[PDB]
């Protein structure tokens, strides 16, 4: 055996029939904050099983023209059950995540996705003298999309895939934790991301941390007759989530 896989977090289990390994952060596995690394003095909440479980985001359809999609974490999870409720009531919070991207096709289908987690993915505006707006940056649990031509917009993100919205060669996104989903061999990608930041904890609304990017480097392709509806689903689980600075809820 060993291509098969089962992951249980909380009251949720994920199983895979054909995976690779599981890529782990920068070799670091997530863990709660240590007293020697801590600065906020209040006793943290560590809900556990109620918050560190698998949340399944909206699905997306892969078509032969899709340039790619991206989601920003914690943003994408701000509305998911108790994880989201804890984000609201707390000034500070930190967490790691197990990200499981799903996509089954057929044997007669072909294509290959890059699944990367880019820590701190500051993005450029389409128009040089402006800053993109919150929504061009993140539509929550709804994927934003890259484009196969220069985006124009007065406040949009310069989404042309080739520069991954960051002004770099999309082909070098590889120094970040990633896996590929080459339909020929794979069907899912699982990446465990430790909490990476220049501070022990941070506010979860004003900072994004890392962005999941799914980019097809070899396009979906198939002969007529084969099913044309090939969704890509994303299930994520916070890991070792702690919060500090409880007060009333909201942004502001």
């Amino acid at each position: 055996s060993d291509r098969v896989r089962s992951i249980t977090l909380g009251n949720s289990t994920i199983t895979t029939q054909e995976c690779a390994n599981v890529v782990v952060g920068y070799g670091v596995w997530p863990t709660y904050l240590k007293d020697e690394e801590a600065t906020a003095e209040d006793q943290p909440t560590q809900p556990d099983v109620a918050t560190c479980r698998f949340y399944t985001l909206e699905s997306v359809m892969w078509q032969q023209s899709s340039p790619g999609w991206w989601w920003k974490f914690p943003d994408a999870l701000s509305n998911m059950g108790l994880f989201g409720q804890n984000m609201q009531y707390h000034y500070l919070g930190r967490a790691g995540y197990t990200i499981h991207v799903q996509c089954n096709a057929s044997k007669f289908h072909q294509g290959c996705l890059l699944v990367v987690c880019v820590p701190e993915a500051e993005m450029g505006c389409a128009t040089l003298a402006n800053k993109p707006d919150p929504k061009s940056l993140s539509k929550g649990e709804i994927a934003n999309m890259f484009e196969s031509q220069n985006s124009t917009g007065e406040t949009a993100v310069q989404a042309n895939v080739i520069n991954a919205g960051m002004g770099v060669g999309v082909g070098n996104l590889t120094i970040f934790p990633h896996q590929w989903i080459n339909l020929r061999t794979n069907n899912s990608a699982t990446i465990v991301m430790p909490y990476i930041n220049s501070v022990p904890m941070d506010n979860m609304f004003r900072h994004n941390n890392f962005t999941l990017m799914v980019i097809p480097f070899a396009p979906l392709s198939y002969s007529t007759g084969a099913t044309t509806y090939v969704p890509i689903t994303v299930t994520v689980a916070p890991m070792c989530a702690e919060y500090n600075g409880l007060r009333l809820a909201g942004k502001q």
Binding site: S1, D2, V4, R5, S6, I7, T8, L9, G10, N11, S12, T13, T15, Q17, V22, V49, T98, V192
Partner: protein, 271 residues
């Protein structure tokens, strides 16, 4: 007693408990701990009441019939050829198993009633009944006062009204190594003749009558017969009877739907 649920936590393995192959004809031995984070629970629940013995070991009416104090010759006495298939309830329980071995506790509830052509100064002394078991082959009675009621060998019970249900215990009297609830075969080697469970059925006949001879006013008595399996052993469980019963001597049925229906595979409204 039942199993404790052992506490379990996060996993990230290549052991896949949830995935199996039911084609093997093998039922998965999964428990909550295998698919979710479990807390530990010390379970004290016992399965005492689902033991085959406690399931079958409760008296059940298997039949009843009547006879009259006076009125002549059919009416006078009654008889029943012992079998457990004329009632729905018990029959369906025994039938959850193909073969069974057990002892029996018979209890009889006998009640009497007055009939309309009343008569004056009707003041009847207490009634005593006699029940006689006639093993296959024994000379059977032909009227309330046939010689066979002397029971020099057949067992009989004499019971008087108002005194508590007569009761006896009978061993496993089968001639095979167990009682068969089903028999997919024939009584004759040429297959002509009867087919099915009735080929095996030969447990004798019960005969009842009043002992005190007929008085002025007519009286009718009903004898209710109760069976209670004891010291039960049961083999080869089978699906419970779906279709209602039609005949006592076979499995004949009217096709019937697998369940009640509902509007769609999506309806939570319990019927």
């Amino acid at each position: 007693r039942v199993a404790d649920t052992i506490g379990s936590g996060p996993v990230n393995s290549e052991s896949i408990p949830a995935l199996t192959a039911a084609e093997t004809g093998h039922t998965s031995q999964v428990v909550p701990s295998d698919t979710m984070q479990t807390r530990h629970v010390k379970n004290y629940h016992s399965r005492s009441e689902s033991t085959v013995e406690n399931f079958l070991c409760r008296s059940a009416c298997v039949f009843y019939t009547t006879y009259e104090n006076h009125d002549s010759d059919g009416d006078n006495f009654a008889y029943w050829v012992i079998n457990t298939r004329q009632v729905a309830q018990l029959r369906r329980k025994l039938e959850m198993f193909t073969y069974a071995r057990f002892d029996l506790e018979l209890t009889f509830v006998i009640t009497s009633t007055q009939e309309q052509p009343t008569v004056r100064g009707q003041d009847a002394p207490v009634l005593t009944h006699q029940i006689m078991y006639v093993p296959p082959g024994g000379p059977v009675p032909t009227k309330v006062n046939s010689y066979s009621w002397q029971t020099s060998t057949n067992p009989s019970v004499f019971w008087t009204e108002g005194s508590a249900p007569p009761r006896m215990s009978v061993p496993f009297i089968g001639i095979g190594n167990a009682y068969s609830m089903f028999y997919d075969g024939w009584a004759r080697f040429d297959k002509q003749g009867t087919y099915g469970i009735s080929t095996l059925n030969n447990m004798g006949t019960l005969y009842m009558r009043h002992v005190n001879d007929g008085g002025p006013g007519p009286i009718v008595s009903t004898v209710r017969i109760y069976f209670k399996p004891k010291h039960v052993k049961t083999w080869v469980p089978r699906p419970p009877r779906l279709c209602q019963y039609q005949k006592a001597g076979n499995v004949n049925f009217e096709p019937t739907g697998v369940t009640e229906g509902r509007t769609d595979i999506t309806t939570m409204k319990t019927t």
